[PDB]
mmCIF file of all heavy atoms in Angstrom:
data_model
loop_
_atom_site.group_PDB
_atom_site.id
_atom_site.type_symbol
_atom_site.label_atom_id
_atom_site.label_comp_id
_atom_site.label_asym_id
_atom_site.label_seq_id
_atom_site.Cartn_x
_atom_site.Cartn_y
_atom_site.Cartn_z
ATOM 1 N N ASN A 1 -15.387 12.320 6.816
ATOM 2 C CA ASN A 1 -14.580 13.295 6.153
ATOM 3 C C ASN A 1 -13.343 13.741 6.822
ATOM 4 O O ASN A 1 -12.661 14.665 6.339
ATOM 5 C CB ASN A 1 -15.412 14.476 5.708
ATOM 6 C CG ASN A 1 -16.529 14.203 4.783
ATOM 7 O OD1 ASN A 1 -16.768 13.006 4.361
ATOM 8 N ND2 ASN A 1 -17.141 15.213 4.254
ATOM 9 N N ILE A 2 -13.073 13.161 8.032
ATOM 10 C CA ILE A 2 -11.922 13.638 8.855
ATOM 11 C C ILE A 2 -11.082 12.441 9.170
ATOM 12 O O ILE A 2 -9.881 12.488 8.820
ATOM 13 C CB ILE A 2 -12.402 14.306 10.111
ATOM 14 C CG1 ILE A 2 -13.318 15.553 9.678
ATOM 15 C CG2 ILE A 2 -11.247 14.677 11.038
ATOM 16 C CD1 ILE A 2 -13.942 16.227 10.852
ATOM 17 N N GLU A 3 -11.540 11.447 9.866
ATOM 18 C CA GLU A 3 -10.799 10.336 10.229
ATOM 19 C C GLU A 3 -10.584 9.415 9.023
ATOM 20 O O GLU A 3 -11.409 9.463 8.061
ATOM 21 C CB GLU A 3 -11.367 9.476 11.401
ATOM 22 C CG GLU A 3 -12.610 8.706 11.152
ATOM 23 C CD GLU A 3 -13.002 7.836 12.291
ATOM 24 O OE1 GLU A 3 -12.325 6.748 12.424
ATOM 25 O OE2 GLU A 3 -13.885 8.175 13.051
ATOM 26 N N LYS A 4 -9.535 8.605 9.082
ATOM 27 C CA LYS A 4 -9.231 7.606 8.047
ATOM 28 C C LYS A 4 -9.007 6.297 8.808
ATOM 29 O O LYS A 4 -8.332 6.249 9.882
ATOM 30 C CB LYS A 4 -7.994 7.976 7.245
ATOM 31 C CG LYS A 4 -8.181 9.261 6.403
ATOM 32 C CD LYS A 4 -9.251 9.160 5.376
ATOM 33 C CE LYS A 4 -9.450 10.498 4.738
ATOM 34 N N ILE A 5 -9.509 5.218 8.285
ATOM 35 C CA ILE A 5 -9.511 3.915 8.889
ATOM 36 C C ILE A 5 -8.625 3.086 7.927
ATOM 37 O O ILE A 5 -8.944 2.957 6.812
ATOM 38 C CB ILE A 5 -10.948 3.298 9.018
ATOM 39 C CG1 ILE A 5 -11.738 4.266 9.889
ATOM 40 C CG2 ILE A 5 -10.807 1.921 9.657
ATOM 41 C CD1 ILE A 5 -13.119 3.761 10.382
ATOM 42 N N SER A 6 -7.604 2.440 8.548
ATOM 43 C CA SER A 6 -6.608 1.657 7.806
ATOM 44 C C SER A 6 -6.564 0.256 8.343
ATOM 45 O O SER A 6 -6.759 -0.039 9.474
ATOM 46 C CB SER A 6 -5.255 2.180 7.938
ATOM 47 O OG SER A 6 -5.179 3.614 7.515
ATOM 48 N N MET A 7 -6.359 -0.732 7.431
ATOM 49 C CA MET A 7 -6.151 -2.133 7.721
ATOM 50 C C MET A 7 -4.639 -2.408 7.942
ATOM 51 O O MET A 7 -3.782 -1.627 7.429
ATOM 52 C CB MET A 7 -6.779 -2.927 6.681
ATOM 53 C CG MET A 7 -8.197 -2.840 6.387
ATOM 54 S SD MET A 7 -8.790 -3.864 5.126
ATOM 55 C CE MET A 7 -8.014 -3.056 3.724
ATOM 56 N N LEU A 8 -4.384 -3.443 8.682
ATOM 57 C CA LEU A 8 -2.982 -3.769 9.013
ATOM 58 C C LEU A 8 -2.449 -4.830 8.035
ATOM 59 O O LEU A 8 -3.087 -5.877 7.799
ATOM 60 C CB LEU A 8 -2.901 -4.386 10.438
ATOM 61 C CG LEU A 8 -3.290 -3.467 11.560
ATOM 62 C CD1 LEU A 8 -2.988 -4.087 12.841
ATOM 63 C CD2 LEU A 8 -2.654 -2.110 11.357
ATOM 64 N N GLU A 9 -1.209 -4.524 7.481
ATOM 65 C CA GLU A 9 -0.567 -5.506 6.686
ATOM 66 C C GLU A 9 0.192 -6.489 7.545
ATOM 67 O O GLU A 9 0.155 -7.727 7.374
ATOM 68 C CB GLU A 9 0.364 -4.831 5.686
ATOM 69 C CG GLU A 9 1.227 -5.771 4.909
ATOM 70 C CD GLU A 9 2.055 -5.117 3.762
ATOM 71 O OE1 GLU A 9 1.478 -4.242 3.072
ATOM 72 O OE2 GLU A 9 3.232 -5.446 3.669
ATOM 73 N N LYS A 10 0.960 -5.994 8.596
ATOM 74 C CA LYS A 10 1.786 -6.759 9.433
ATOM 75 C C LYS A 10 2.095 -6.119 10.689
ATOM 76 O O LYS A 10 2.271 -4.932 10.856
ATOM 77 C CB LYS A 10 3.136 -7.084 8.698
ATOM 78 C CG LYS A 10 4.019 -8.119 9.419
ATOM 79 C CD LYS A 10 3.281 -9.459 9.498
ATOM 80 C CE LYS A 10 4.155 -10.543 10.010
ATOM 81 N NZ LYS A 10 3.454 -11.849 10.059
ATOM 82 N N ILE A 11 2.074 -6.948 11.813
ATOM 83 C CA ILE A 11 2.482 -6.581 13.129
ATOM 84 C C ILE A 11 3.964 -7.046 13.384
ATOM 85 O O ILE A 11 4.224 -8.192 12.982
ATOM 86 C CB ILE A 11 1.519 -7.260 14.155
ATOM 87 C CG1 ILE A 11 0.141 -6.532 14.202
ATOM 88 C CG2 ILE A 11 2.168 -7.218 15.498
ATOM 89 C CD1 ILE A 11 -0.971 -7.402 14.730
ATOM 90 N N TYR A 12 4.741 -6.261 14.042
ATOM 91 C CA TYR A 12 6.073 -6.615 14.401
ATOM 92 C C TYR A 12 6.258 -6.268 15.932
ATOM 93 O O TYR A 12 6.194 -5.138 16.291
ATOM 94 C CB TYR A 12 7.137 -5.823 13.595
ATOM 95 C CG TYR A 12 6.926 -6.042 12.188
ATOM 96 C CD1 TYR A 12 6.203 -5.106 11.416
ATOM 97 C CD2 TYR A 12 7.637 -7.002 11.504
ATOM 98 C CE1 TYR A 12 6.045 -5.294 10.055
ATOM 99 C CE2 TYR A 12 7.472 -7.183 10.122
ATOM 100 C CZ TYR A 12 6.695 -6.322 9.462
ATOM 101 O OH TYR A 12 6.608 -6.480 8.079
ATOM 102 N N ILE A 13 6.564 -7.246 16.649
ATOM 103 C CA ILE A 13 6.775 -7.042 18.192
ATOM 104 C C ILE A 13 8.270 -7.269 18.506
ATOM 105 O O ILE A 13 8.949 -8.079 17.844
ATOM 106 C CB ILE A 13 5.906 -8.113 18.895
ATOM 107 C CG1 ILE A 13 4.446 -7.878 18.521
ATOM 108 C CG2 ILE A 13 6.142 -8.003 20.458
ATOM 109 C CD1 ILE A 13 3.554 -8.755 19.275
ATOM 110 N N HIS A 14 8.721 -6.389 19.392
ATOM 111 C CA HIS A 14 10.164 -6.490 19.721
ATOM 112 C C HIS A 14 10.498 -7.980 20.155
ATOM 113 O O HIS A 14 9.742 -8.502 20.985
ATOM 114 C CB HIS A 14 10.523 -5.546 20.836
ATOM 115 C CG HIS A 14 11.990 -5.328 20.972
ATOM 116 N ND1 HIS A 14 12.798 -6.277 21.431
ATOM 117 C CD2 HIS A 14 12.750 -4.284 20.647
ATOM 118 C CE1 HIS A 14 14.012 -5.834 21.370
ATOM 119 N NE2 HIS A 14 14.038 -4.591 20.922
ATOM 120 N N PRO A 15 11.558 -8.552 19.625
ATOM 121 C CA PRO A 15 11.815 -9.965 19.873
ATOM 122 C C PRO A 15 12.183 -10.255 21.365
ATOM 123 O O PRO A 15 12.083 -11.340 21.775
ATOM 124 C CB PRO A 15 12.959 -10.358 18.900
ATOM 125 C CG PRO A 15 13.587 -9.052 18.603
ATOM 126 C CD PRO A 15 12.484 -8.014 18.618
ATOM 127 N N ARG A 16 12.609 -9.240 22.111
ATOM 128 C CA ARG A 16 12.949 -9.339 23.522
ATOM 129 C C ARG A 16 11.940 -8.599 24.401
ATOM 130 O O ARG A 16 12.222 -8.320 25.576
ATOM 131 C CB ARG A 16 14.356 -8.928 23.752
ATOM 132 C CG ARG A 16 15.400 -9.672 22.946
ATOM 133 C CD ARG A 16 16.809 -9.279 23.351
ATOM 134 N NE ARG A 16 17.117 -9.614 24.796
ATOM 135 C CZ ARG A 16 18.165 -9.250 25.411
ATOM 136 N NH1 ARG A 16 19.096 -8.458 24.832
ATOM 137 N NH2 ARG A 16 18.407 -9.612 26.664
ATOM 138 N N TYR A 17 10.679 -8.440 24.006
ATOM 139 C CA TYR A 17 9.710 -7.896 24.745
ATOM 140 C C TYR A 17 9.458 -8.860 25.925
ATOM 141 O O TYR A 17 9.192 -10.090 25.708
ATOM 142 C CB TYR A 17 8.374 -7.732 23.885
ATOM 143 C CG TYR A 17 7.093 -7.724 24.635
ATOM 144 C CD1 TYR A 17 6.876 -6.737 25.600
ATOM 145 C CD2 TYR A 17 5.989 -8.462 24.226
ATOM 146 C CE1 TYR A 17 5.573 -6.639 26.209
ATOM 147 C CE2 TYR A 17 4.793 -8.424 24.879
ATOM 148 C CZ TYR A 17 4.531 -7.558 25.906
ATOM 149 O OH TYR A 17 3.315 -7.413 26.512
ATOM 150 N N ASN A 18 9.412 -8.339 27.174
ATOM 151 C CA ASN A 18 9.368 -9.206 28.358
ATOM 152 C C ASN A 18 7.999 -9.083 28.908
ATOM 153 O O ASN A 18 7.754 -8.351 29.840
ATOM 154 C CB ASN A 18 10.503 -8.819 29.314
ATOM 155 C CG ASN A 18 10.533 -9.734 30.487
ATOM 156 O OD1 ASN A 18 9.700 -10.528 30.749
ATOM 157 N ND2 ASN A 18 11.674 -9.680 31.222
ATOM 158 N N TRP A 19 7.029 -9.892 28.428
ATOM 159 C CA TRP A 19 5.727 -9.892 28.955
ATOM 160 C C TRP A 19 5.550 -10.754 30.172
ATOM 161 O O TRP A 19 4.655 -10.523 30.964
ATOM 162 C CB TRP A 19 4.663 -10.398 27.971
ATOM 163 C CG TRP A 19 5.015 -11.757 27.330
ATOM 164 C CD1 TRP A 19 5.681 -11.940 26.132
ATOM 165 C CD2 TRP A 19 4.769 -13.043 27.820
ATOM 166 N NE1 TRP A 19 5.804 -13.282 25.845
ATOM 167 C CE2 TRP A 19 5.218 -14.025 26.946
ATOM 168 C CE3 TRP A 19 4.113 -13.481 28.976
ATOM 169 C CZ2 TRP A 19 5.127 -15.409 27.124
ATOM 170 C CZ3 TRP A 19 3.973 -14.848 29.127
ATOM 171 C CH2 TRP A 19 4.502 -15.813 28.221
ATOM 172 N N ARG A 20 6.604 -11.540 30.492
ATOM 173 C CA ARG A 20 6.524 -12.423 31.646
ATOM 174 C C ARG A 20 6.756 -11.532 32.955
ATOM 175 O O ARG A 20 5.949 -11.770 33.926
ATOM 176 C CB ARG A 20 7.521 -13.496 31.603
ATOM 177 C CG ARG A 20 7.210 -14.515 30.431
ATOM 178 C CD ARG A 20 8.351 -15.514 30.300
ATOM 179 N NE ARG A 20 7.930 -16.621 29.436
ATOM 180 C CZ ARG A 20 7.167 -17.628 29.924
ATOM 181 N NH1 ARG A 20 6.813 -17.709 31.226
ATOM 182 N NH2 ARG A 20 6.728 -18.585 29.042
ATOM 183 N N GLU A 21 7.613 -10.659 32.883
ATOM 184 C CA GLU A 21 8.073 -9.981 34.196
ATOM 185 C C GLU A 21 7.583 -8.596 34.312
ATOM 186 O O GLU A 21 6.876 -8.301 35.301
ATOM 187 C CB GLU A 21 9.640 -10.028 34.262
ATOM 188 C CG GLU A 21 10.131 -9.369 35.525
ATOM 189 C CD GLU A 21 11.560 -9.089 35.661
ATOM 190 O OE1 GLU A 21 12.384 -9.491 34.687
ATOM 191 O OE2 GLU A 21 11.993 -8.473 36.656
ATOM 192 N N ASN A 22 8.075 -7.669 33.427
ATOM 193 C CA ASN A 22 7.959 -6.221 33.726
ATOM 194 C C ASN A 22 7.607 -5.410 32.521
ATOM 195 O O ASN A 22 7.787 -4.158 32.524
ATOM 196 C CB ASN A 22 9.217 -5.703 34.435
ATOM 197 C CG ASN A 22 10.447 -5.940 33.635
ATOM 198 O OD1 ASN A 22 10.363 -6.559 32.542
ATOM 199 N ND2 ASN A 22 11.583 -5.516 34.159
ATOM 200 N N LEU A 23 7.195 -6.043 31.386
ATOM 201 C CA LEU A 23 7.055 -5.309 30.105
ATOM 202 C C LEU A 23 8.249 -4.547 29.655
ATOM 203 O O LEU A 23 8.224 -3.585 28.900
ATOM 204 C CB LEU A 23 5.807 -4.300 30.151
ATOM 205 C CG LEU A 23 4.472 -4.885 30.564
ATOM 206 C CD1 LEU A 23 3.383 -3.862 30.363
ATOM 207 C CD2 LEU A 23 4.117 -6.221 29.882
ATOM 208 N N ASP A 24 9.515 -5.105 29.927
ATOM 209 C CA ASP A 24 10.647 -4.518 29.320
ATOM 210 C C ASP A 24 10.614 -4.629 27.789
ATOM 211 O O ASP A 24 10.081 -5.581 27.198
ATOM 212 C CB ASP A 24 11.852 -5.369 29.813
ATOM 213 C CG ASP A 24 13.174 -4.669 29.596
ATOM 214 O OD1 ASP A 24 13.197 -3.424 29.432
ATOM 215 O OD2 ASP A 24 14.248 -5.412 29.717
ATOM 216 N N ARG A 25 10.980 -3.505 27.167
ATOM 217 C CA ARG A 25 10.977 -3.442 25.669
ATOM 218 C C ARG A 25 9.549 -3.484 25.131
ATOM 219 O O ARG A 25 9.289 -4.268 24.210
ATOM 220 C CB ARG A 25 11.916 -4.456 25.006
ATOM 221 C CG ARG A 25 13.300 -4.393 25.644
ATOM 222 C CD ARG A 25 14.279 -5.459 24.978
ATOM 223 N NE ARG A 25 15.493 -5.607 25.760
ATOM 224 C CZ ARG A 25 15.497 -6.578 26.772
ATOM 225 N NH1 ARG A 25 14.505 -7.411 27.055
ATOM 226 N NH2 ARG A 25 16.674 -6.670 27.448
ATOM 227 N N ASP A 26 8.626 -2.673 25.707
ATOM 228 C CA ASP A 26 7.260 -2.695 25.394
ATOM 229 C C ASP A 26 6.966 -1.864 24.139
ATOM 230 O O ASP A 26 6.483 -0.668 24.180
ATOM 231 C CB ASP A 26 6.494 -2.209 26.626
ATOM 232 C CG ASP A 26 4.976 -2.384 26.432
ATOM 233 O OD1 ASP A 26 4.553 -3.179 25.541
ATOM 234 O OD2 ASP A 26 4.206 -1.886 27.245
ATOM 235 N N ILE A 27 7.304 -2.438 23.020
ATOM 236 C CA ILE A 27 7.155 -1.706 21.782
ATOM 237 C C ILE A 27 6.796 -2.632 20.587
ATOM 238 O O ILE A 27 7.262 -3.855 20.529
ATOM 239 C CB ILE A 27 8.569 -0.955 21.486
ATOM 240 C CG1 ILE A 27 8.405 0.046 20.359
ATOM 241 C CG2 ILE A 27 9.666 -1.940 21.164
ATOM 242 C CD1 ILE A 27 9.570 0.996 20.315
ATOM 243 N N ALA A 28 5.993 -2.135 19.710
ATOM 244 C CA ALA A 28 5.545 -2.884 18.498
ATOM 245 C C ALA A 28 5.327 -1.830 17.397
ATOM 246 O O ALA A 28 4.995 -0.693 17.651
ATOM 247 C CB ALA A 28 4.277 -3.621 18.744
ATOM 248 N N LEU A 29 5.450 -2.280 16.200
ATOM 249 C CA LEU A 29 5.172 -1.581 14.971
ATOM 250 C C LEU A 29 4.030 -2.261 14.196
ATOM 251 O O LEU A 29 3.962 -3.530 14.193
ATOM 252 C CB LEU A 29 6.462 -1.521 14.087
ATOM 253 C CG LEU A 29 7.439 -0.476 14.601
ATOM 254 C CD1 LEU A 29 8.845 -0.793 13.921
ATOM 255 C CD2 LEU A 29 6.977 0.942 14.213
ATOM 256 N N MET A 30 3.283 -1.436 13.521
ATOM 257 C CA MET A 30 2.189 -1.919 12.572
ATOM 258 C C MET A 30 2.371 -1.313 11.314
ATOM 259 O O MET A 30 2.391 -0.014 11.202
ATOM 260 C CB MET A 30 0.831 -1.692 13.177
ATOM 261 C CG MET A 30 0.562 -2.369 14.578
ATOM 262 S SD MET A 30 -0.975 -2.043 15.405
ATOM 263 C CE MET A 30 -0.721 -0.310 15.808
ATOM 264 N N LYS A 31 2.494 -2.085 10.193
ATOM 265 C CA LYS A 31 2.577 -1.579 8.833
ATOM 266 C C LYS A 31 1.243 -1.617 8.220
ATOM 267 O O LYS A 31 0.452 -2.594 8.337
ATOM 268 C CB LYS A 31 3.508 -2.391 7.982
ATOM 269 C CG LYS A 31 3.787 -1.860 6.557
ATOM 270 C CD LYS A 31 4.780 -2.642 5.733
ATOM 271 C CE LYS A 31 5.140 -1.999 4.500
ATOM 272 N N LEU A 32 0.721 -0.445 7.640
ATOM 273 C CA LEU A 32 -0.554 -0.346 7.068
ATOM 274 C C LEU A 32 -0.584 -0.953 5.712
ATOM 275 O O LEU A 32 0.420 -1.012 4.918
ATOM 276 C CB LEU A 32 -0.980 1.086 7.030
ATOM 277 C CG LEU A 32 -0.864 1.846 8.324
ATOM 278 C CD1 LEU A 32 -1.368 3.279 8.130
ATOM 279 C CD2 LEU A 32 -1.505 1.118 9.476
ATOM 280 N N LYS A 33 -1.762 -1.447 5.296
ATOM 281 C CA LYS A 33 -1.920 -2.029 3.950
ATOM 282 C C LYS A 33 -1.727 -1.029 2.882
ATOM 283 O O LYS A 33 -1.157 -1.328 1.823
ATOM 284 C CB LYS A 33 -3.273 -2.688 3.796
ATOM 285 C CG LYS A 33 -3.425 -3.993 4.570
ATOM 286 C CD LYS A 33 -4.611 -4.829 4.013
ATOM 287 C CE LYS A 33 -5.022 -5.948 4.911
ATOM 288 N NZ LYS A 33 -6.207 -6.644 4.485
ATOM 289 N N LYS A 34 -2.066 0.208 3.101
ATOM 290 C CA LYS A 34 -1.990 1.220 2.117
ATOM 291 C C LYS A 34 -1.591 2.510 2.838
ATOM 292 O O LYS A 34 -1.865 2.701 4.049
ATOM 293 C CB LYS A 34 -3.351 1.600 1.385
ATOM 294 C CG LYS A 34 -3.982 0.417 0.768
ATOM 295 C CD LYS A 34 -5.435 0.714 0.237
ATOM 296 N N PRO A 35 -0.798 3.448 2.149
ATOM 297 C CA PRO A 35 -0.439 4.703 2.836
ATOM 298 C C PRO A 35 -1.629 5.554 3.134
ATOM 299 O O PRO A 35 -2.615 5.534 2.468
ATOM 300 C CB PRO A 35 0.521 5.351 1.775
ATOM 301 C CG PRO A 35 -0.002 4.782 0.490
ATOM 302 C CD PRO A 35 -0.337 3.396 0.731
ATOM 303 N N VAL A 36 -1.526 6.258 4.295
ATOM 304 C CA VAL A 36 -2.558 7.119 4.696
ATOM 305 C C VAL A 36 -2.321 8.557 4.273
ATOM 306 O O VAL A 36 -1.121 9.017 4.259
ATOM 307 C CB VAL A 36 -2.791 7.110 6.220
ATOM 308 C CG1 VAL A 36 -1.602 7.655 6.940
ATOM 309 C CG2 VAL A 36 -4.086 7.904 6.623
ATOM 310 N N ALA A 37 -3.357 9.254 3.749
ATOM 311 C CA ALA A 37 -3.140 10.627 3.271
ATOM 312 C C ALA A 37 -3.031 11.532 4.404
ATOM 313 O O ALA A 37 -3.956 11.578 5.338
ATOM 314 C CB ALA A 37 -4.235 11.076 2.308
ATOM 315 N N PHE A 38 -2.067 12.394 4.483
ATOM 316 C CA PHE A 38 -1.896 13.415 5.478
ATOM 317 C C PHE A 38 -2.932 14.543 5.257
ATOM 318 O O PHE A 38 -3.385 14.732 4.099
ATOM 319 C CB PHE A 38 -0.503 14.006 5.592
ATOM 320 C CG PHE A 38 0.588 12.963 5.855
ATOM 321 C CD1 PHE A 38 1.914 13.327 5.658
ATOM 322 C CD2 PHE A 38 0.342 11.723 6.398
ATOM 323 C CE1 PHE A 38 2.895 12.404 5.902
ATOM 324 C CE2 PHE A 38 1.322 10.793 6.694
ATOM 325 C CZ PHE A 38 2.628 11.193 6.428
ATOM 326 N N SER A 39 -3.248 15.265 6.282
ATOM 327 C CA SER A 39 -4.222 16.227 6.299
ATOM 328 C C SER A 39 -4.006 17.228 7.433
ATOM 329 O O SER A 39 -3.041 17.050 8.176
ATOM 330 C CB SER A 39 -5.666 15.704 6.349
ATOM 331 O OG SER A 39 -5.901 15.190 7.661
ATOM 332 N N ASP A 40 -4.937 18.207 7.670
ATOM 333 C CA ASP A 40 -4.846 19.073 8.820
ATOM 334 C C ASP A 40 -4.876 18.197 10.166
ATOM 335 O O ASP A 40 -4.448 18.674 11.159
ATOM 336 C CB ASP A 40 -5.991 20.003 8.858
ATOM 337 C CG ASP A 40 -5.791 21.148 7.901
ATOM 338 O OD1 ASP A 40 -4.666 21.363 7.352
ATOM 339 O OD2 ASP A 40 -6.773 21.930 7.696
ATOM 340 N N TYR A 41 -5.505 17.014 10.019
ATOM 341 C CA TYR A 41 -5.813 16.158 11.251
ATOM 342 C C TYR A 41 -4.885 14.917 11.333
ATOM 343 O O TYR A 41 -5.001 14.198 12.355
ATOM 344 C CB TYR A 41 -7.241 15.689 11.103
ATOM 345 C CG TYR A 41 -8.150 16.881 10.817
ATOM 346 C CD1 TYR A 41 -8.713 16.991 9.539
ATOM 347 C CD2 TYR A 41 -8.401 17.815 11.795
ATOM 348 C CE1 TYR A 41 -9.507 18.120 9.222
ATOM 349 C CE2 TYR A 41 -9.257 18.890 11.450
ATOM 350 C CZ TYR A 41 -9.748 19.035 10.221
ATOM 351 O OH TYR A 41 -10.543 20.192 9.916
ATOM 352 N N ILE A 42 -4.062 14.735 10.290
ATOM 353 C CA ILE A 42 -3.321 13.490 10.242
ATOM 354 C C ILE A 42 -1.941 13.911 9.817
ATOM 355 O O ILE A 42 -1.697 14.379 8.699
ATOM 356 C CB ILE A 42 -3.933 12.539 9.154
ATOM 357 C CG1 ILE A 42 -5.333 12.071 9.612
ATOM 358 C CG2 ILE A 42 -3.017 11.319 8.939
ATOM 359 C CD1 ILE A 42 -6.068 11.181 8.566
ATOM 360 N N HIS A 43 -0.957 13.692 10.639
ATOM 361 C CA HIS A 43 0.437 14.077 10.378
ATOM 362 C C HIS A 43 1.407 13.351 11.310
ATOM 363 O O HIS A 43 1.044 13.164 12.496
ATOM 364 C CB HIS A 43 0.515 15.577 10.607
ATOM 365 C CG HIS A 43 1.813 16.171 10.043
ATOM 366 N ND1 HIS A 43 1.774 16.558 8.729
ATOM 367 C CD2 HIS A 43 3.053 16.354 10.516
ATOM 368 C CE1 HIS A 43 3.058 17.034 8.471
ATOM 369 N NE2 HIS A 43 3.848 16.863 9.527
ATOM 370 N N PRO A 44 2.504 12.861 10.837
ATOM 371 C CA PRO A 44 3.403 12.120 11.695
ATOM 372 C C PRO A 44 4.268 12.877 12.739
ATOM 373 O O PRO A 44 4.575 13.998 12.448
ATOM 374 C CB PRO A 44 4.320 11.407 10.721
ATOM 375 C CG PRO A 44 4.447 12.401 9.530
ATOM 376 C CD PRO A 44 3.045 13.073 9.417
ATOM 377 N N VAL A 45 4.514 12.199 13.823
ATOM 378 C CA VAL A 45 5.415 12.676 14.828
ATOM 379 C C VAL A 45 6.858 12.289 14.523
ATOM 380 O O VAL A 45 7.023 11.264 13.758
ATOM 381 C CB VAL A 45 5.014 12.134 16.227
ATOM 382 C CG1 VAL A 45 5.268 10.710 16.350
ATOM 383 C CG2 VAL A 45 5.570 12.915 17.353
#
């Protein structure tokens, strides 16, 4: 009744993420299959 569990539609990794050397550009986005309902416990930064 508090947490919400979401499935992933798509992962997007920075195209110049440098995993070989030093994790330069260590960023990725995940799009959810369905929008999550905000609540007292769920709210965006």
Side-chain angles (χ1 to χ4, degrees), residues 1-3 5-30 32-33 35-45:
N1 296 4
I2 301 173
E3 73 170 283
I5 303 191
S6 302
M7 298 177 296
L8 297 188
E9 178 174 314
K10 189 62 176 179
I11 288 159
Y12 304 91
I13 300 185
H14 196 289
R16 302 188 63 191
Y17 161 52
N18 187 346
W19 52 265
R20 294 175 166 278
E21 182 191 352
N22 56 0
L23 303 190
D24 197 17
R25 308 181 197 88
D26 190 12
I27 192 166
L29 284 160
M30 300 176 290
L32 307 187
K33 286 198 192 175
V36 65
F38 300 163
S39 73
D40 284 347
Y41 313 105
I42 298 178
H43 196 87
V45 72

